[PDB]
Coordinates of C-alpha atoms and ligand atoms in Angstrom, one line a residue:
Chain A
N164 CA -0.1 0.1 -0.1
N165 CA 1.3 3.4 -0.9
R166 CA -1.2 5.3 1.1
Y167 CA -0.3 6.6 4.7
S168 CA -2.7 8.3 7.1
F169 CA -1.7 10.5 10.3
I170 CA -4.2 10.8 12.9
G171 CA -3.8 13.4 15.6
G172 CA -5.5 12.4 18.8
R173 CA -5.1 10.3 22.1
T174 CA -3.2 7.1 20.9
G175 CA -0.4 6.2 18.4
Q176 CA 3.2 5.4 18.2
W177 CA 4.5 8.9 18.6
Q178 CA 4.2 11.7 21.3
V179 CA 3.6 15.2 20.4
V180 CA 6.4 17.5 21.5
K181 CA 5.2 20.5 20.1
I182 CA 3.2 22.0 17.1
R183 CA 4.4 25.3 15.4
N184 CA 1.8 26.7 13.1
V185 CA 4.4 28.5 10.9
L186 CA 2.1 29.6 8.2
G187 CA -1.8 29.5 7.2
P188 CA -4.3 28.1 9.5
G189 CA -2.6 25.5 12.1
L190 CA -3.3 22.0 13.5
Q191 CA -4.9 21.5 17.2
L192 CA -2.4 20.2 19.6
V193 CA -2.9 16.5 20.5
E194 CA -1.0 14.1 22.7
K195 CA 0.0 11.5 20.0
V196 CA 0.2 11.1 16.5
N197 CA -1.1 7.6 15.1
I198 CA 0.4 6.6 11.7
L199 CA -1.1 3.8 9.5
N200 CA -0.4 2.3 6.3
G201 CA -3.6 2.6 4.6
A202 CA -6.6 5.0 3.9
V203 CA -8.7 5.6 7.1
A204 CA -12.4 6.7 6.3
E205 CA -13.4 6.2 10.1
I206 CA -12.2 9.3 12.0
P207 CA -11.2 7.6 15.2
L208 CA -12.5 8.7 18.7
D209 CA -11.3 11.5 20.6
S210 CA -9.0 12.5 17.5
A211 CA -8.7 16.0 16.3
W212 CA -7.3 15.5 12.6
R213 CA -6.4 13.2 10.0
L214 CA -3.6 13.8 7.3
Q215 CA -3.1 11.7 4.5
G216 CA -0.9 11.2 1.3
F217 CA 0.6 8.5 -1.1
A218 CA 4.0 7.5 -1.9
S219 CA 4.6 8.4 -5.8
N220 CA 7.3 8.7 -8.4
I221 CA 10.1 11.2 -8.7
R222 CA 9.1 14.4 -10.3
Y223 CA 12.2 16.6 -10.3
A224 CA 15.1 14.7 -9.5
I225 CA 17.4 13.9 -12.1
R226 CA 19.6 10.4 -12.5
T227 CA 22.9 11.9 -10.8
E228 CA 21.1 13.6 -7.9
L229 CA 19.3 10.4 -7.6
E230 CA 22.7 8.7 -7.2
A231 CA 24.2 11.2 -5.0
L232 CA 21.2 10.6 -2.6
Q233 CA 21.3 7.0 -2.6
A234 CA 25.0 7.0 -1.7
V235 CA 24.2 8.8 1.7
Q236 CA 20.6 8.6 2.7
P237 CA 19.7 6.7 5.6
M238 CA 16.7 4.4 6.2
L239 CA 13.9 5.2 8.2
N240 CA 13.3 3.3 11.6
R241 CA 17.0 3.8 12.8
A242 CA 17.0 2.7 16.3
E243 CA 18.7 6.2 17.3
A244 CA 16.1 8.2 15.3
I245 CA 13.9 8.9 18.4
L246 CA 12.8 12.3 17.1
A247 CA 10.6 12.8 14.1
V248 CA 8.9 16.1 12.5
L249 CA 5.8 16.0 10.3
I250 CA 5.6 18.9 8.0
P251 CA 2.4 19.7 5.9
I252 CA 2.8 22.0 3.1
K253 CA 0.6 23.5 0.7
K254 CA 1.8 25.5 -2.5
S255 CA 0.1 28.3 -4.3
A256 CA -2.0 27.9 -7.5
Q257 CA 0.4 30.0 -9.2
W258 CA 2.8 27.3 -8.5
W259 CA 0.8 24.6 -10.1
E260 CA -0.1 26.3 -13.2
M261 CA 3.3 26.7 -14.1
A262 CA 4.9 24.3 -16.6
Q263 CA 7.7 21.7 -15.6
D264 CA 10.9 23.3 -16.6
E265 CA 9.6 26.4 -14.7
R266 CA 9.1 24.4 -11.7
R267 CA 12.1 22.5 -12.1
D268 CA 14.4 25.6 -12.7
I269 CA 12.7 27.0 -9.2
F270 CA 13.3 23.9 -7.6
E271 CA 17.1 23.2 -7.9
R272 CA 18.6 25.8 -10.1
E273 CA 17.4 28.6 -8.1
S274 CA 16.6 27.0 -4.6
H275 CA 19.1 24.3 -4.7
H276 CA 16.8 22.1 -2.7
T277 CA 18.6 18.9 -3.3
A278 CA 22.1 20.2 -3.0
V279 CA 20.9 21.9 0.3
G280 CA 19.4 18.8 1.7
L281 CA 22.4 16.7 1.1
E282 CA 24.4 18.6 3.4
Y283 CA 21.8 17.1 6.2
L284 CA 22.3 13.5 5.3
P285 CA 23.1 10.9 6.9
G286 CA 21.8 12.3 10.2
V287 CA 18.2 13.1 8.7
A288 CA 16.1 10.5 7.2
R289 CA 13.0 11.5 5.1
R290 CA 9.7 10.3 3.4
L291 CA 7.9 12.4 0.9
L292 CA 4.2 12.1 0.5
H293 CA 2.0 13.7 -1.9
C294 CA -1.9 14.7 -1.1
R295 CA -2.9 17.6 -3.7
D296 CA -4.4 15.0 -6.0
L297 CA -6.5 13.4 -3.3
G298 CA -8.4 16.7 -2.4
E299 CA -6.7 17.3 0.9
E300 CA -6.1 20.7 2.4
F301 CA -2.3 20.4 2.0
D302 CA -0.5 19.3 -1.1
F303 CA 2.4 17.3 0.8
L304 CA 3.1 15.3 4.0
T305 CA 7.0 15.6 4.6
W306 CA 8.6 13.4 7.2
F307 CA 11.8 13.5 9.1
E308 CA 13.4 11.5 11.6
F309 CA 16.9 12.0 13.4
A310 CA 18.7 11.2 16.7
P311 CA 18.5 14.3 19.1
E312 CA 22.2 15.3 18.4
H313 CA 20.8 16.6 14.8
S314 CA 17.9 18.6 16.1
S315 CA 20.0 21.9 15.9
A316 CA 21.1 21.1 12.2
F317 CA 17.4 20.2 11.3
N318 CA 16.4 23.7 12.7
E319 CA 18.9 25.3 10.6
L320 CA 17.8 23.5 7.6
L321 CA 14.1 24.7 7.8
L322 CA 15.4 28.3 8.1
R323 CA 17.4 27.9 4.8
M324 CA 14.6 26.2 2.9
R325 CA 12.3 29.0 4.2
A326 CA 14.7 31.6 2.7
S327 CA 14.8 30.0 -0.7
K328 CA 12.9 31.0 -3.8
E329 CA 10.8 28.0 -3.8
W330 CA 9.3 28.9 -0.5
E331 CA 7.7 32.1 -1.9
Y332 CA 5.0 29.9 -3.4
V333 CA 4.3 28.1 -0.1
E334 CA 1.1 29.3 1.4
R335 CA 0.5 26.7 4.2
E336 CA 3.2 25.1 6.8
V337 CA 2.8 23.3 10.0
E338 CA 5.4 21.5 12.2
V339 CA 4.5 18.7 14.0
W340 CA 7.5 17.6 16.4
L341 CA 7.4 14.1 17.7
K342 CA 9.1 11.5 20.1
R343 CA 9.0 7.7 19.5
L344 CA 7.3 6.2 22.1
Chain B
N169 CA -13.7 17.8 -8.6
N170 CA -10.5 16.3 -10.0
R171 CA -11.6 12.6 -10.0
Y172 CA -13.6 11.0 -13.1
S173 CA -15.0 7.6 -13.1
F174 CA -16.0 5.3 -16.1
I175 CA -18.3 2.5 -15.6
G176 CA -18.9 -0.2 -18.2
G177 CA -22.2 -1.9 -18.5
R178 CA -25.8 -1.4 -19.5
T179 CA -26.1 2.6 -19.1
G180 CA -24.2 5.7 -19.9
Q181 CA -23.9 8.8 -22.2
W182 CA -21.6 6.8 -24.6
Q183 CA -22.2 3.5 -26.7
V184 CA -19.5 1.2 -27.1
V185 CA -18.6 0.6 -30.5
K186 CA -15.8 -1.6 -30.1
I187 CA -13.3 -2.8 -27.8
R188 CA -9.6 -3.7 -28.9
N189 CA -7.8 -5.4 -26.4
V190 CA -4.1 -4.2 -27.9
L191 CA -1.7 -5.4 -25.0
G192 CA -2.1 -7.5 -21.8
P193 CA -5.4 -8.8 -20.1
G194 CA -8.4 -6.8 -21.9
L195 CA -11.7 -5.3 -20.7
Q196 CA -15.0 -7.3 -21.0
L197 CA -17.0 -6.0 -23.9
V198 CA -20.1 -3.9 -22.8
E199 CA -22.9 -2.0 -24.4
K200 CA -22.4 1.5 -22.7
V201 CA -20.0 3.5 -20.6
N202 CA -21.3 6.0 -17.9
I203 CA -19.0 8.7 -17.2
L204 CA -19.2 10.6 -13.8
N205 CA -17.4 13.4 -12.2
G206 CA -16.4 11.9 -8.8
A207 CA -15.5 8.7 -7.0
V208 CA -17.9 5.7 -7.1
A209 CA -17.3 3.2 -4.4
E210 CA -20.9 1.6 -4.9
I211 CA -20.2 -1.0 -7.7
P212 CA -23.2 0.0 -10.1
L213 CA -25.6 -2.7 -11.0
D214 CA -25.1 -5.0 -14.2
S215 CA -21.6 -3.2 -14.5
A216 CA -18.6 -5.3 -15.9
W217 CA -15.9 -2.8 -14.7
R218 CA -15.1 0.5 -13.3
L219 CA -12.1 2.7 -14.1
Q220 CA -11.2 6.0 -12.4
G221 CA -8.6 8.8 -12.3
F222 CA -7.7 12.2 -11.4
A223 CA -6.7 15.3 -13.4
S224 CA -3.3 16.5 -12.2
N225 CA -0.5 18.8 -12.8
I226 CA 1.7 18.8 -15.8
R227 CA 4.7 16.3 -15.5
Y228 CA 6.9 16.7 -18.8
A229 CA 5.6 19.6 -20.9
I230 CA 7.7 22.7 -20.9
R231 CA 6.4 26.3 -21.3
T232 CA 7.0 26.7 -24.9
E233 CA 5.2 23.3 -25.5
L234 CA 2.4 24.4 -23.3
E235 CA 2.1 27.5 -25.4
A236 CA 1.9 25.7 -28.7
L237 CA -0.7 23.2 -27.3
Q238 CA -2.9 26.3 -26.0
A239 CA -2.7 27.8 -29.3
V240 CA -4.5 25.1 -31.3
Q241 CA -6.1 22.4 -28.8
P242 CA -9.9 22.1 -28.9
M243 CA -12.3 22.2 -26.1
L244 CA -14.2 19.2 -25.1
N245 CA -17.6 18.5 -26.0
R246 CA -18.0 20.2 -29.4
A247 CA -20.9 19.5 -31.2
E248 CA -19.3 17.5 -34.0
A249 CA -17.3 15.5 -31.5
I250 CA -19.5 12.6 -31.8
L251 CA -16.6 9.7 -31.6
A252 CA -14.3 9.1 -28.8
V253 CA -11.9 6.6 -27.8
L254 CA -10.9 5.8 -24.0
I255 CA -7.3 4.2 -23.8
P256 CA -6.2 2.8 -20.5
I257 CA -2.3 2.5 -20.4
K258 CA 0.0 0.8 -17.9
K259 CA 3.8 1.5 -17.9
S260 CA 6.5 -0.9 -16.6
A261 CA 8.2 -0.9 -13.3
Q262 CA 11.2 0.2 -15.2
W263 CA 9.7 3.1 -16.7
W264 CA 8.5 4.0 -13.1
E265 CA 12.0 3.6 -11.3
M266 CA 13.5 5.8 -13.8
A267 CA 14.6 9.7 -13.0
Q268 CA 12.8 12.7 -14.3
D269 CA 15.4 13.5 -16.7
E270 CA 15.5 10.0 -18.1
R271 CA 11.7 9.9 -18.5
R272 CA 11.5 13.3 -20.0
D273 CA 14.1 12.3 -22.7
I274 CA 12.4 9.3 -23.7
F275 CA 9.0 11.1 -23.7
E276 CA 10.1 14.0 -26.0
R277 CA 13.7 13.9 -27.1
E278 CA 13.5 10.3 -28.5
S279 CA 9.6 9.7 -29.1
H280 CA 8.4 13.4 -29.9
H281 CA 5.3 12.7 -28.1
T282 CA 4.2 16.4 -28.1
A283 CA 5.3 17.3 -31.6
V284 CA 3.7 14.2 -33.0
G285 CA 0.5 14.8 -30.9
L286 CA 0.2 18.4 -32.1
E287 CA 0.0 17.3 -35.8
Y288 CA -3.6 16.0 -34.9
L289 CA -5.0 19.1 -33.5
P290 CA -7.4 20.8 -33.7
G291 CA -9.2 17.7 -35.1
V292 CA -8.5 15.7 -31.8
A293 CA -9.8 16.8 -28.2
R294 CA -8.2 15.0 -25.3
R295 CA -8.1 14.6 -21.6
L296 CA -5.6 13.0 -19.4
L297 CA -6.2 11.1 -16.1
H298 CA -3.5 9.5 -13.8
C299 CA -4.5 6.5 -11.5
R300 CA -1.3 4.6 -10.6
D301 CA -1.3 6.7 -7.4
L302 CA -4.9 5.5 -6.5
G303 CA -3.8 1.7 -6.9
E304 CA -5.6 1.1 -10.2
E305 CA -4.6 -1.9 -12.5
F306 CA -3.9 0.9 -15.0
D307 CA -1.5 3.8 -14.7
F308 CA -3.4 6.2 -17.2
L309 CA -6.8 6.9 -18.6
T310 CA -6.6 8.9 -21.8
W311 CA -9.6 10.3 -23.6
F312 CA -9.8 11.6 -27.1
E313 CA -12.9 12.7 -29.0
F314 CA -13.5 13.8 -32.8
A315 CA -15.6 14.2 -35.7
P316 CA -15.7 11.2 -37.8
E317 CA -13.8 12.9 -40.6
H318 CA -11.0 12.5 -38.3
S319 CA -11.2 9.0 -37.5
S320 CA -8.5 7.7 -40.1
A321 CA -6.2 10.4 -38.9
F322 CA -6.8 9.4 -35.3
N323 CA -5.9 5.8 -36.4
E324 CA -2.8 6.9 -37.9
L325 CA -1.7 8.7 -34.6
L326 CA -2.2 5.6 -32.7
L327 CA 0.1 3.5 -35.1
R328 CA 2.9 6.2 -34.8
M329 CA 2.8 6.4 -30.8
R330 CA 3.1 2.7 -30.6
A331 CA 6.1 2.5 -32.7
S332 CA 7.8 4.9 -30.4
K333 CA 10.6 4.5 -28.0
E334 CA 8.1 5.5 -25.2
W335 CA 5.8 2.4 -25.9
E336 CA 8.6 -0.1 -25.3
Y337 CA 7.5 0.7 -21.7
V338 CA 4.0 0.0 -22.0
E339 CA 2.9 -3.3 -20.7
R340 CA -1.0 -3.1 -21.0
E341 CA -3.2 -1.3 -23.3
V342 CA -7.0 -1.2 -24.4
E343 CA -8.8 0.9 -26.8
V344 CA -12.7 1.6 -25.9
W345 CA -14.2 3.2 -28.9
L346 CA -17.4 5.2 -28.3
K347 CA -20.0 7.2 -29.9
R348 CA -22.1 9.9 -28.1
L349 CA -25.8 9.3 -27.3
Ligands
HEM673 C1 16.6 16.5 4.7 C2 17.1 16.5 3.5 C3 16.2 16.8 2.1 C4 16.3 16.3 1.1 C5 17.7 15.5 0.8 C6 15.5 16.4 0.3 C7 15.3 16.0 -1.1 C8 14.3 16.2 -1.9 C9 14.2 16.0 -3.3 C10 15.2 15.2 -3.9 C11 12.8 16.2 -3.5 C12 12.3 16.1 -5.1 C13 11.6 14.7 -5.0 C14 11.1 14.4 -6.4 O1 11.7 14.5 -7.7 O2 10.1 13.7 -6.6 C15 12.3 16.7 -2.5 C16 10.9 17.3 -2.7 C17 10.3 18.0 -1.7 N1 11.0 18.4 -0.5 FE1 12.5 17.8 0.2 N2 14.5 17.2 0.9 C18 15.0 17.4 2.2 C19 14.2 18.1 3.3 C20 13.2 18.9 3.1 C21 12.6 20.0 4.0 C22 13.0 20.3 5.3 C23 11.3 20.3 3.5 C24 10.3 21.2 4.0 C25 10.2 21.6 5.3 C26 11.2 19.7 2.1 C27 10.1 20.0 1.4 C28 10.0 19.2 0.3 C29 8.9 19.2 -0.8 C30 7.5 20.1 -0.7 C31 9.0 18.4 -1.8 C32 8.1 18.3 -2.9 C33 8.4 19.4 -4.2 C34 7.0 19.6 -5.4 O3 6.9 18.6 -5.9 O4 6.7 20.8 -5.4 N3 12.2 19.1 2.1 N4 12.9 16.7 -1.5
HEM674 C1 -3.6 13.9 -29.9 C2 -2.6 14.8 -29.5 C3 -1.8 14.2 -28.4 C4 -1.1 15.5 -27.8 C5 -1.2 16.8 -28.4 C6 -0.7 14.7 -26.4 C7 0.0 15.6 -25.7 C8 0.6 15.1 -24.5 C9 1.2 15.9 -23.6 C10 1.9 17.3 -23.9 C11 1.6 15.2 -22.4 C12 2.3 15.3 -21.2 C13 1.6 15.8 -20.3 C14 2.2 16.1 -19.0 O1 3.5 17.0 -19.0 O2 1.8 16.2 -17.9 C15 1.0 13.8 -22.6 C16 0.9 12.7 -21.8 C17 0.3 11.4 -22.4 N1 -0.2 11.1 -23.3 FE1 -0.5 12.2 -25.0 N2 -1.0 13.5 -26.6 C18 -1.7 13.1 -27.6 C19 -2.1 12.0 -28.0 C20 -1.7 10.6 -27.3 C21 -2.4 9.4 -27.3 C22 -3.2 8.9 -28.6 C23 -2.1 8.6 -26.5 C24 -2.2 7.2 -26.2 C25 -3.0 6.5 -27.0 C26 -1.2 9.4 -25.3 C27 -0.9 9.0 -24.1 C28 -0.4 9.8 -23.2 C29 0.1 9.3 -21.9 C30 0.0 7.9 -21.6 C31 0.6 10.2 -21.3 C32 1.1 10.2 -19.9 C33 2.6 10.0 -20.1 C34 3.1 10.1 -18.5 O3 2.8 10.7 -17.7 O4 3.9 9.1 -18.2 N3 -1.4 10.7 -26.0 N4 0.4 13.7 -24.1
CL675 CL1 11.2 10.3 -0.5
CL676 CL1 -4.5 17.2 -20.6

């Protein structure tokens, strides 16, 4: 199954450390996030919100970028990676109406998204889900996990991304910080 | 709503003229196709099959290409567009694991998908839907409609595309030919 659901409420494998409502309307604070590998129609009891999205194909990265990523990126579920951060993102209509070269140019040529992210590997593990195509309020669910040592670096990475040309098209962002139970 | 469903069975706005099972397991012949703008979980009565997909953002076309398409491409549901073809396509794992430059190159540089297709506009209208990401048996639903004067031409277009490098990656294809009621 390529579909993943994230349920904020009173149960789950993760503990909410904090939520930062960076841009746009925020998400309600909850005790825990429950993550599932399937669609969930039945909104669980004592749960404030459901996010969902699917794993998909590459949309921007070229072969050499892929090769570079594969050489250093860590797997998920390292025993040390006890911290995680869920970051929903929505981009603007002006971004989506742009052609594929335009988007590619802003993504790597101007914002160096891959080159910058590579500096934070192997400390940081990541998963990218898509959800615009499902009719969700956000376009993307981004997932990061790392050991505490790397929390500082990760905060540094967030502030760099937010300074890029790419982030000018971002109209909604929340940080959910998590600790594995 | 970005989601479209296509049900084969005994009702619909379109009459099945024929079904050609081009490559891989085919679709059961039926009398009619019902086309809905939404999901359909409730498998309709006396129906053989259901295909669905969503309209999505551009994945390959560059801005100059988009400009050429917009100059000529017809709208859907012209009075004279009484013939249609629905063509589900599945591409191979090997296609899907390739990077974004690699697919772009096979699609346009080697296959000239857009340059070739542009020779058949404005006679042919088209819609493109995606459904790998929903876990369908097909990766894509393609939709083409035109006046009969253009049928021969449309047939030439199919044979050109299928001789392309792109089409070596296609592992399942069915043409459903229709007539408007
Ligand atoms: C930590 C290292 C990171 C690496 C190595 C990295 C790498 C990548 C790569 C290669 C893609 C393109 C995937 C594709 O072609 O389909 C991507 C997409 C994305 N990344 Fe990152 N990323 C990192 C961190 C982050 C962070 C911190 C954020 C946001 C807070 C972020 C947000 C995104 C978004 C939204 C996309 C999808 C872009 C779109 O389709 O418009 N990334 N990431
Ligand atoms: C009639 C003129 C045609 C034109 C102008 C045309 C144009 C295009 C364009 C520009 C794209 C790229 C969309 C994007 O970047 O998101 C595309 C995708 C596609 N076209 Fe065509 N097309 C035509 C006919 C056909 C026919 C007859 C078929 C199949 C029988 C076909 C199958 C496809 C498929 C499967 C894709 C998606 C490829 C992918 O995302 O991997 N096209 N078409
Ligand atoms: Cl990923
Ligand atoms: Cl289209």
